[PDB]
């Protein structure tokens, strides 16, 4: 038991602008592998490397190269993206090249775009529990919408008192389009914290939907007069009433 | 090459559930299912014969792969993929993964009480929303396809400590004739669902 670790977990670029993702696993596994998942076609093979300095092309080699200089790592290298690269992307290792478990990292989600212009950060809003879900149920339920935001890389979790909460949520498991009428339609996302009436209805309760967007980085050029959409946080919050 | 059908496949929670591949190459020898999670990385479930609710099996000759559910949870809601490769004896023996079976186990609702509130934005905007809920699992919630109202799938939460799950969707708009009176009336809802006043 350990893992394997990719990095970048979430990035954006423009169409032809060379990126390099990293895989990195540290239970000195011969065998490396680069899949990646899309919509309908499940799992497909990149490239595959058996042992330091054995590398192979998979079943869908083109547009990406790959090393491997040592065993802890194996780096899957874009020259020039494609639209057509936008993926999710699986490195994964095993002691041999199968009849093995396969270990898997998180997934690398690239977005490749023909420019940064229509990237947005989320504006997030909590909405608070109906007095009349209280006085039916004795339950209380908390809404937050996550809006404006593209593309769809982001994280939402609930705080309650400063503490991540799992407990009574649900998320949905994808955004919708805002605007789909619209090109790169910007999406919104909702989820749900259901609590007790008897802890909403205390005022010194203090709840937080939190969305963690993952946009352009540091160096990337930024020239529309609104705030560069870097990676970065973005709440909205309620407190408990008596009501 | 591995035939895998992506579902999704619904049943009811205490439901058996039938998954499974078909295959062509007569070397595959060892056949494992991996279960992914939402977007998350596939992990190894069976490689096995029996293991408690989950049993694996494997016929050769008709080259098919099944994995059984016994009393389906829930939490078993995922994608399940079939992999399977050569013996390590041989040459190449590349582990390769069928394309996943989508499962939605379906939560058994014990006491519906169906209900559409409206919730106001905690900041102040005049913005508020919809939320349908405690509806049983036998509902779906349609998108309405009007351009100008957003309406969410039906997501299950667990209030773990209660015994208690509950469905719920949330639909929101800025049309000015929006209201959470009509804000489902593109879905088929219970006929005693509350409109608190």
């Known amino acids: 038991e350990a893992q394997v670790t990719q990095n970048p977990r979430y990035l954006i670029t423009v169409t032809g602008k060379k990126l390099t993702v990293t895989c990195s696993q540290n239970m000195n596994h011969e065998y490396m592998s680069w899949y990646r998942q899309d919509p309908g076609l499940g799992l497909r093979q990149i490239y595959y490397?058996?042992?330091?300095?054995?590398?192979d092309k998979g079943d869908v080699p083109e547009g990406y190269k790959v090393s491997r200089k040592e065993k802890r790592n194996f780096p899957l290298i874009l020259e020039s993206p494609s639209p057509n690269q936008t993926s999710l992307y699986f490195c994964?290792?095993?002691?041999?090249?199968?009849?093995?478990?396969?270990?898997f990292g998180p997934g690398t989600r690239l977005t490749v775009l023909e420019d940064l212009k229509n990237v947005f950060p989320p504006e997030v809003a909590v909405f608070e529990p109906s007095e009349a879900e209280i006085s039916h149920t004795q339950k209380a339920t908390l809404v937050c919408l996550a809006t404006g935001f593209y593309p769809d890389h982001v994280e939402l979790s609930w705080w309650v008192n400063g503490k991540e909460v799992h407990s009574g949520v649900c998320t949905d498991p994808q955004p919708l389009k805002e605007q789909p009428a619209l090109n790169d339609s910007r999406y919104a996302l909702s989820s749900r914290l259901r609590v007790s009436a008897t802890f909403w209805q205390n005022p010194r309760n203090h709840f937080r939907c939190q969305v963690q967007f993952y946009g352009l980085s540091e160096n990337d050029e930024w020239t529309q007069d609104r705030a560069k959409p870097v990676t970065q946080i973005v709440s909205a919050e309620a407190w408990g009433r008596a009501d | 090459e591995v035939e895998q059908d992506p579902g999704p496949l619904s049943v009811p929670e205490g439901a058996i559930v039938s998954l499974n591949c078909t295959y062509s190459?007569?070397?595959?020898?060892?056949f494992m299912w991996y279960r992914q999670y939402s977007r998350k990385g596939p992990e190894l479930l069976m490689y096995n014969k029996e293991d408690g609710r989950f049993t694996a099996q494997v016929d050769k000759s008709s080259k098919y792969i099944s994995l059984f559910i016994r009393d389906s949870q829930p939490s078993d809601s995922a994608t399940y993929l079939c992999a399977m490769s050569g013996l390590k004896e041989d040459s190449s023996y590349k582990l390769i993964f069928g394309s996943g079976t989508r499962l939605l186990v379906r939560p058994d609702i014990q006491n519906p009480d169906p209900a559409v509130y409206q919730l106001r934005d905690s900041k102040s905007s005049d913005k508020s929303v919809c939320l349908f809920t405690d509806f049983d699992s036998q509902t779906n919630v349609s998108q309405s396809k009007d351009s100008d109202v957003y309406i969410t799938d039906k997501c299950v939460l667990d209030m773990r400590s209660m015994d208690f799950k509950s469905n719920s969707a949330v639909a929101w708009s800025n049309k000015s004739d929006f209201a959470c009176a009509n804000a489902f009336n593109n879905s088929i809802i219970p006929e005693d669902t509350f409109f608190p006043s």
């Open positions: 490397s058996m042992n330091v300095e054995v590398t």
């Open positions: 190459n007569s070397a595959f020898q060892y």
């Open positions: 994964a290792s095993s002691i041999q090249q199968g009849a093995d478990t396969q270990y």
